[PDB]
Write an enzyme that holds these catalytic residues in place. Structure first.
Site, short mmCIF file in Angstrom:
data_model
loop_
_atom_site.label_atom_id
_atom_site.label_comp_id
_atom_site.label_asym_id
_atom_site.label_seq_id
_atom_site.Cartn_x
_atom_site.Cartn_y
_atom_site.Cartn_z
N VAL A 278 0.83 -1.20 0.00
CA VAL A 278 0.00 0.00 0.00
C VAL A 278 0.87 1.25 0.00
CG1 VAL A 278 -1.45 1.41 1.49
CG2 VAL A 278 -2.13 -0.94 0.95
N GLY A 279 2.02 1.17 0.66
CA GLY A 279 2.91 2.32 0.76
C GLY A 279 3.90 2.19 1.90
N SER A 280 5.14 2.60 1.66
CA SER A 280 6.21 2.42 2.64
C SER A 280 7.02 3.70 2.75
CB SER A 280 7.12 1.25 2.26
OG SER A 280 7.75 1.47 1.01
N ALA B 209 9.78 5.78 5.97
CA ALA B 209 10.87 5.45 6.88
C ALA B 209 10.38 4.64 8.07
CB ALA B 209 11.58 6.72 7.35
N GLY C 281 7.87 2.08 8.27
CA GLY C 281 7.87 0.67 7.93
C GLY C 281 7.15 0.46 6.62
N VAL D 136 3.74 -1.15 4.69
CA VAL D 136 2.32 -1.37 4.93
C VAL D 136 1.76 -2.21 3.80
CG1 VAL D 136 0.06 -0.31 5.24
CG2 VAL D 136 2.09 0.79 6.19
N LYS E 159 1.25 -3.26 9.04
CA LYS E 159 2.54 -2.58 9.04
C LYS E 159 3.60 -3.50 9.63
CE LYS E 159 3.04 1.83 10.07
NZ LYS E 159 3.17 3.08 10.87
N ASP F 122 0.27 8.45 13.75
CA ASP F 122 1.65 8.79 14.11
C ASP F 122 1.79 9.44 15.48
OD1 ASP F 122 1.19 8.96 11.11
OD2 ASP F 122 3.38 8.81 11.15
C1 LIG Z 1 -1.40 -0.71 12.99
C2 LIG Z 1 -1.24 0.54 13.57
C3 LIG Z 1 -0.96 1.63 12.81
C4 LIG Z 1 -0.82 1.52 11.40
C5 LIG Z 1 -0.54 2.63 10.58
C6 LIG Z 1 -0.42 2.50 9.21
C7 LIG Z 1 -0.18 3.70 8.35
N1 LIG Z 1 0.93 4.38 8.65
N2 LIG Z 1 1.27 5.47 7.95
C8 LIG Z 1 0.50 5.88 6.95
N3 LIG Z 1 0.93 7.00 6.28
C9 LIG Z 1 -0.04 7.87 5.60
C10 LIG Z 1 0.64 8.66 4.51
N4 LIG Z 1 1.68 9.54 5.09
C11 LIG Z 1 1.93 9.21 6.52
C12 LIG Z 1 2.13 7.72 6.68
C13 LIG Z 1 -0.66 5.22 6.58
C14 LIG Z 1 -1.04 4.09 7.30
C15 LIG Z 1 -2.30 3.40 6.94
C16 LIG Z 1 -3.24 3.03 7.91
C17 LIG Z 1 -4.42 2.44 7.52
N5 LIG Z 1 -4.74 2.18 6.24
C18 LIG Z 1 -3.84 2.53 5.32
C19 LIG Z 1 -2.63 3.13 5.61
C20 LIG Z 1 -0.57 1.23 8.63
C21 LIG Z 1 -0.84 0.14 9.40
C22 LIG Z 1 -0.97 0.25 10.81
C23 LIG Z 1 -1.27 -0.86 11.64
#
Ligand SMILES: c1ccc2cc(-c3nnc(N4CCNCC4)cc3-c3ccncc3)ccc2c1
Ligand SMILES: Fc1ccc(-c2n[nH]cc2-c2ccncc2)cc1
Ligand SMILES: Fc1ccc(-c2n[nH]cc2-c2ccncc2)cc1
Ligand SMILES: [Zn+2]
Length: 335
Positions: A26-28, A30, A32, A34, A49, A164
């Protein structure tokens, strides 16, 4: 213990319980990597993640522990929460990977503001949700510190969750100045910047660097007054601030012309230079701007959050073990 299965995708390796199927990147960043997955136990699409180098240094290991402790504590509709946390390792000795699971979120507020102009009613709901989550976060004595549009997950329902818990465009000025003792109202400042952007469709303070960032801020809110100046202990910062050519506070009613006058009034209360004078999250929720969403009985606070570990000096293996303890002791929320 579940049954795990291994798989490689985008170079990174993933070993997850069989309940999570159809993994797709889905997108990565720094933080981790996802993956979106289909959760066969619940029927939900989730985001998984995988932490990257979770124990590469004492800095990483403490960060990993801090992240897991926070995520396990957050239980609020407008704050990203934990559906599950797991590791393929069967013992502390092999423990080296940490996976987190949450509801799949479609987009972030950055993709929405950049993809369309929002009516005043959408701004009300979006900002209301941020403030509702912020009141919960702040009630636990937690500061986000890095609120910005790309840190706000939104789905096609326009439901919003804080994640975050240039970034400089949204940071409070006292941080720009290195104030050692900023408070939670730094987050209120970020919300004001975000709200202004939703209404106008333009970044409010697009500074090219920290110096230009502060110049832009003072152009709108004015140079510090006598009461605020009396509060600056850093002799170099006071010297710099007083050496600046004096700017007046602009009338926001003119800067945000055409915007809802109730929105303009709330912006005035959030974008105040003196952090002691900014509106809190709880106070902001009661602002007439949110009259159609405000429910004082459905704006909950958080349980006490023990942050004592932050001042502890431990070995990587002790942070690693403490993180393991937190993985094992997790209890999933009520289905
Ligand atoms: C457990 C706890 C927290 C989690 C956070 C993420 C996550 N982190 N950063 C994300 N960014 C969004 C874009 N710029 C900042 C980083 C998105 C997402 C995310 C969450 C849900 N749907 C899709 C994407 C993904 C999985 C997670 C699992
Ligand atoms: F130019 C500025 C911009 C912001 C501030 C400020 N606002 N709230 C708190 C402070 C602050 C900054 C530095 N030292 C103490 C307090 C002070 C001067
Ligand atoms: F955070 C700070 C700390 C010190 C200063 C400062 N004091 N005197 C002159 C300056 C200064 C620093 C950088 N750019 C212009 C002017 C400016 C910002
Ligand atoms: Zn690092």
């Amino acid at each position: 213990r579940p049954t795990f299965y291994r798989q490689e995708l985008n170079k990174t390796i993933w070993e997850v319980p069989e309940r999570y199927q159809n993994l797709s990147p889905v997108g990565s960043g720094a933080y981790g990597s996802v993956c979106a997955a289909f959760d066969t136990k619940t029927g939900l699409r989730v985001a998984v993640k995988k932490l990257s180098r979770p124990f590469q240094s004492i800095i990483h290991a403490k960060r990993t522990y801090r992240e897991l402790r926070l995520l396990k504590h957050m239980k609020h509709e407008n704050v990203i929460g934990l559906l599950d946390v797991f590791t393929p390792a069967r013992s502390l000795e092999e423990f080296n990977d940490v996976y987190l699971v949450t509801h799949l979120m479609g987009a972030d507020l950055n993709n929405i503001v950049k993809c369309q102009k929002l009516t005043d009613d959408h701004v009300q709901f979006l900002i209301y949700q941020i403030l509702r989550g912020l009141k919960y976060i702040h009630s636990a004595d937690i500061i986000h510190r890095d609120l910005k549009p790309s840190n706000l997950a939104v789905n096609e329902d326009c439901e919003l969750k804080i994640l975050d818990f240039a970034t400089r465009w949204y940071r409070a000025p006292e941080i720009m100045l290195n104030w050692m003792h900023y408070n939670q109202t730094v987050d209120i400042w970020s919300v004001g910047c975000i709200m202004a952007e939703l209404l106008t469709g333009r970044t409010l303070f697009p500074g090219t660097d920290h110096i230009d960032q502060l110049k832009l801020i003072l152009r709108l809110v004015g140079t510090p007054g006598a009461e605020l100046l009396k509060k600056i202990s850093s002799e170099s910062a006071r010297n710099y601030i007083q050496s600046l050519t004096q700017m007046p506070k602009m009338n926001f009613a003119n800067v945000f012309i055409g915007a809802n006058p109730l929105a303009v009034d709330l912006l005035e209360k959030m974008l105040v230079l003196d952090s002691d004078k900014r509106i809190t999250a709880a106070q902001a929720l009661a602002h007439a701007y949110f009259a159609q969403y405000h429910d004082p009985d459905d704006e909950p606070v958080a349980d006490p959050y023990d942050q004592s570990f932050e001042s502890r000096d431990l070995l990587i293996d002790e942070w690693k073990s403490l993180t393991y303890d937190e993985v094992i002791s997790f209890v999933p929320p009520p289905l």
